Each structure stands twice: as C-alpha cells, then as structure tokens.
Amino acid sequence: MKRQNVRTLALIVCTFTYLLVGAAVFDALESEPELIERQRLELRQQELRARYNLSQGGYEELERVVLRLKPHKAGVQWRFAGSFYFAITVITTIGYGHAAPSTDGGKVFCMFYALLGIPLTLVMFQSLGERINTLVRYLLHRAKDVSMANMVLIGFFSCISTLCIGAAAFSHYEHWTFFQAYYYCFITLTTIGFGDYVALQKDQALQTQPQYVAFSFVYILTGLTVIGAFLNLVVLRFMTMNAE
Amino acid sequence: MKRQNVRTLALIVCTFTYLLVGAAVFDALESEPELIERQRLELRQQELRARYNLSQGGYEELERVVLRLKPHKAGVQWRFAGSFYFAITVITTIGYGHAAPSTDGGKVFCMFYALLGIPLTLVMFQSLGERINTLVRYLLHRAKDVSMANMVLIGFFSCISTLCIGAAAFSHYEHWTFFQAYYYCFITLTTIGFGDYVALQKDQALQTQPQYVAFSFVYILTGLTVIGAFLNLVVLRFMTMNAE
Ligand SMILES: CC(C)CCC[C@@H](C)[C@H]1CC[C@H]2[C@@H]3CC=C4C[C@@H](OC(=O)CCC(=O)O)CC[C@]4(C)[C@H]3CC[C@]12C
Ligand SMILES: CC(C)CCC[C@@H](C)[C@H]1CC[C@H]2[C@@H]3CC=C4C[C@@H](OC(=O)CCC(=O)O)CC[C@]4(C)[C@H]3CC[C@]12C
Ligand SMILES: CC(C)CCC[C@@H](C)[C@H]1CC[C@H]2[C@@H]3CC=C4C[C@@H](OC(=O)CCC(=O)O)CC[C@]4(C)[C@H]3CC[C@]12C
Ligand SMILES: CC(C)CCC[C@@H](C)[C@H]1CC[C@H]2[C@@H]3CC=C4C[C@@H](OC(=O)CCC(=O)O)CC[C@]4(C)[C@H]3CC[C@]12C
Ligand SMILES: [K+]
Ligand SMILES: [K+]
Ligand SMILES: [K+]
C-alpha cells in the first residue's frame, strides 16, 4: 500500500526538519556563552599556573591526575549499592556513565547484560503500564463512559505530578535548586541521562543513607513506569498503525 | 483476566532477580580494581604535589580549574555541527552528555525539544523498521515460504554486521582498538550511551572532517533503525500481547 510509504517519508522529512531546527536553536543559544566561558577559564588557568610557578609539563601531569581522579571523588562507587544503581542505569538505558566498567571483563559482561536486559525491561514496563492504564479506565468508570480525552488528561497530570514530587524530593536531599532537580528528573525519566547531574554521589550516600538509596531506586523504577504508561497510551496508538 | 496479572508479576520478579544478579556480578568484577586504582592515584597525587611543592589549597584550585576545562578540551563543541550532534543524542535518547546545555535557557529548550522529539523519533524508527522488515520478507520470498526462523536469523546477522562494520570504521578513525570501538558501537546503538567513549571529539573533527561527521551521523541513524527493526520483530511480538 502507498499510505505506509507516504507516512514513512513524511516522518523522515519531519525528523530531519526537527533536527535542523534543534541544531539551529542550540547553536544560537549556547555557542556564544561557550566561547566566553572558555576565554575566562583559559585566563584563570594561566593566572593560577603563574601564581604557583607551575611548569607546563607539571600542569599537564596534574591535569592527567585530576582527570583520572574525577570519578573517585564520588568515593567508592563499585559496591553492592552502587553496582545495583549501575545495573539500573544499564537495563533502563539511562546510562549516566558516572560509573562505567573499567576492566575488559566488566565491559564484556556489561554487553551481554544489556543484551538480555533491555528487551526484558521494555516488556516489563509495557506490561505494567498497560495494567495501570486498565486500572485508570476501571476507576474512572467507577467514578462515573471513558474516552481518550480523559485518559490522556489523567496520564499527562500523572507525569507532571511525578516530575513535581521528584523535583521536590531531590532539591531537598541533594541541595540542588528546584529547577535543577526538575531538570535532573526530566532527563532521567526520558532515559536521556546526560550525567551532568547524578543523584547518590554526595556524602557517600551509597553506603551511608540506605533510605535515600531506596527512595531513588523506587522513584526511578516508578517514574519510568508512569512514562511508559503514557507512551503506551499516546504513541503506541500511532506506531503499530503500519500493521493495520 | 488472570493471565495478564500472572505475566506482570512474573516479569517484575524476573526483573528484580536480573538486577540482583547484575549487581552481584558487577560488584565481584569491579570493586577490587576500583580500590587498587584509587590507591595508586592517591599515591601519584601526593607524589606530584610534593614534586611541585603545591599547597593543598592551590591543588584544590587547580583541580577545580581542570575539572571545569575538561569538556573544553574538545575544543568548541557548541557549533552547528556539534549542535546537530547534540540534537541527535537528545532525541534518540543516547545522551552522551559530553555536551550538555550550560544556560538555564538551553535547559528549558532542551526539555521541550526532548518532549516533542522523542515520541516522533520512536514513531519514525518503528515505521521505518517495519518497512525494512517487509522488504526482507519480500526479498526472501522472491529468493525462494518465510518463517520467523528465517526473519529472526536475518535480523540477528544484520545487527552483528552493523556492529562489525561500525567497530571497523571507528577503530580506524578514532584509533581505538577494535574491542573498544565495538564496545562504543554497542553502547551507542542500544542508546545506553555512557559517554566514556565518544566519537568526533578528537582533532577538531566537528569543524575539520565533514566526511567523518557525516559518516557518524548516518551510522548512528542507520544502526538505530536496524536495531529498531530487530526489536520490532522480537519484542513487539510479546509486549502488546496484553491487548490480546
Ligand atoms: C508526549 C506528548 C507530549 C507528545 C506526543 C507527540 C506524538 C504523539 C506525535 C508527534 C509527531 C506525530 C506524528 C507526525 C506525523 C505523522 C504522519 C501521519 O501520516 C501522514 O501524514 C500520512 C498518512 C497516509 O499517507 O496515510 C500519521 C501521524 C503521524 C505518524 C504523527 C503521529 C503522532 C506523533 C508521533
Ligand atoms: C517496586 C516494588 C514492587 C518493589 C520495591 C523494592 C525496593 C523497596 C527494594 C528493591 C531493591 C532494594 C535495594 C537493594 C540494595 C540495597 C543496598 C543496601 O546496602 C547499602 O546501600 C549499603 C552499601 C552496601 O551494602 O554495600 C541498602 C538497601 C538497598 C538500597 C535496597 C533498598 C530497597 C530496594 C530499593
Ligand atoms: C534481543 C534478543 C537477543 C533477546 C530477546 C529477549 C526477549 C525476547 C525475552 C527475554 C525475557 C522474555 C520474557 C520472559 C517472561 C515472560 C513471561 C511469560 O508469561 C508467563 O510466563 C505467564 C503466562 C500467563 O500467565 O498467561 C510470557 C513471555 C515473557 C513476557 C517473555 C517474552 C520474551 C522476553 C521479553
Ligand atoms: C539517511 C538519509 C535518508 C539521509 C542522509 C542525510 C545525511 C547525508 C546528512 C543529514 C545531516 C547532514 C549534516 C548536517 C550538518 C553538517 C555540518 C557541516 O559543517 C561542519 O561540520 C563544519 C562546522 C560548522 O559548519 O559549523 C558539514 C556537513 C554536515 C556534517 C552534514 C553532513 C551530511 C548529513 C549527515
Ligand atoms: K542514555
Ligand atoms: K551519559
Ligand atoms: K535511552
């Protein structure tokens, strides 16, 4: 049929238009502040290097050392709590990359672990999302017909709710501002996970605050379920339509 | 029906067993080398600090400067080529996070850009994956019936092929070893994207090698399509089954 091919080319051309707009806007927003801050740091580098009479080779070596110690500033991060947090970020595909396997054996196992883990996790969050959509239909009917205008509204406000209570929690535990914590929540639950903000890294929380570690694992696995129950409603309505 | 609830609880219990096994294996693999390397770097820190008679406060300030210059070692990364690469890593949800929005305005726009972009990209890769699955069915029939034992085999070897030719390309352009380039390919195309290995960062490639930038964008968007056409075959067979 022609319809599927027209829809495919409409989606490809739309996606490349969306990328060219995104690239233009991010460049217009960020490429000047980047140059300003780079000039400022290139100045402060020479200021401190002169202030401590540091040889260029010595600065190069100190840079290499600091850039290798950058992750170990988190304290120990490979331990059972932190290995569970890593496994979460692998199979959910968040992948912050603050912890990443250092040995070749850890890399090979990480590859097989993701290989079997990601399908299984997609099938879990699909099944559980469809269960909670059915529950929402049932309870909304008991409160009365039900229509997409109600289901999508309840899904949308359930997402906005889980973002707000995530930002409220993390801006209290991590002392980020509310906007920073809300950004971290959004970037985690879409599974983008840049890793510029990462929870559990301060104050040895991975071995010191089991209640907060538990909260963060439950929040990640719950918010991903609510987002999955929203994509299950709003996107799988359209994606499988080629099979029609 | 009971079946959907039994399947949901079987998937939840399976996922938590899979996490507890993953956490145990990663801890057993990595938590000793971490402590060894941390001891080695804590030694080398004091060695160089003494070798350059560096005050502890001066070391703290040099550490702060180096840790802020760490990304700007990539040269300019917010420019049109690098903003297109960023937009790719946002809407595909790879999110390496080597570039991440520095201003609050770039963060707000990044949030709305992901919000509209990720559904659209899932629907694109679904539609295009189902088209190439239909093409594989058609051509395999022309080469003759067709069965899942053939379709899944061809999908699997198409994935292994795109990983091998990705590793072969990147281990040549980036001078990573083959295993490192294969790891980077696998971690990109599953969209985990830790960001410990990232392409295009060396030698100002973003403004110096348009042919290699083009290759990398085409490889990312093609390999994601082939992986999408594989999940479309092997997982959407099972995920929607709750709707049965
Ligand atoms: C998560 C919330 C906040 C946003 C959700 C957005 C998506 C549900 C939208 C964004 C872009 C939309 C797509 C944009 C373009 C098209 C092509 C359109 O097909 C045609 O125009 C051709 C039809 C034919 O030839 O038969 C079908 C709907 C579809 C897939 C849309 C389906 C719904 C999408 C994925
Ligand atoms: C969503 C429903 C159906 C289940 C919810 C289960 C959670 C309440 C469980 C699942 C995994 C558990 C975690 C698994 C491992 C750990 C590590 C454990 O030890 C440490 O954090 C100290 C460091 C170390 O032990 O090496 C503390 C409890 C904690 C966070 C657990 C807290 C409770 C969690 C989050
Ligand atoms: C990408 C390649 C290399 C690996 C693909 C793996 C998946 C296709 C597998 C991994 C785990 C599997 C799931 C493991 C357990 C179950 C529960 C099973 O349901 C029951 O056991 C209960 C049935 C009922 O109560 O009716 C249905 C299949 C399912 C979803 C499986 C579907 C197929 C999955 C997702
Ligand atoms: C998959 C099929 C259907 C379409 C394939 C399209 C590609 C061949 C296009 C899409 C976007 C293009 C890129 C968009 C932007 C740029 C930046 C441009 O400029 C630079 O890299 C220099 C830096 C600067 O311009 O600021 C060089 C070409 C390049 C990599 C383009 C190369 C060709 C690309 C990858
Ligand atoms: K990611
Ligand atoms: K990352
Ligand atoms: K992802």
Residue numbers in the entry:
A (entry chain A), B (entry chain B): 1 to 144, 153 to 252
From the primary publication:
TASK-1 and TASK-3 are pH-sensitive Two-Pore Domain (K2P/KCNK) K+ channels. Two-Pore Domain K+ (K2P) channels are a structurally distinct subset of K+ channels where each gene encodes a subunit with two pore-forming domains that co-assemble as a dimer to create a single pseudotetrameric K+-selective pore which spans the cell membrane. Here, we resolve structures for both human TASK-1 and TASK-3 by cryoEM, as well as for a recurrent TASK-3 variant (G236R) associated with KCNK9 Imprinting Syndrome (formerly referred to as Birk-Barel Syndrome). Overall, our results provide further insight into the structure of both TASK-1 and TASK-3 channels and demonstrate that the X-gating mechanism is a highly conserved structural gating motif within the TASK channel family that, like many other K+ channels, also exhibits a degree of allosteric coupling between the lower gate and the filter gate.
We were able to resolve this structure to 3.1 Å resolution and the overall structure was found to be consistent with previous biochemical and crystallographic structures of TASK-1. The channel forms a domain-swapped homodimer with four transmembrane helices (M1-M4) in each subunit, a pseudotetrameric selectivity filter similar to other K2Ps, and an extracellular Cap domain that lacks the intermolecular disulphide bridge between chains found in most other K2Ps30. Even though the distal C-terminus beyond A251 is not resolved as well as in the crystal structure, the architecture of the X-gate (243VLRFMT248) is clearly visible and conserved, thus confirming the structural integrity of this gating motif. Cholesterol hemisuccinate was also identified bound to the same external clefts as seen in the TASK-1 crystal structure, i.e., next to the X-gate between the M1, M4 and M2 helices with a second site in a higher cavity along the M4 helices. Interestingly, despite the high degree of structural alignment in most other regions of the structure, the conformation of this pH-sensor in the new cryoEM structure, determined at pH 7.5, is markedly different to that previously found at pH 8.5. At pH 7.5, H98 adopts an alternative rotamer conformation and there is a disruption of the hydrogen bonds between Q77 and Q209. There is no direct comparison available for an equivalent cryoEM structure of TASK-1 at higher pH, however, some density is still also observed for the downward rotamer.
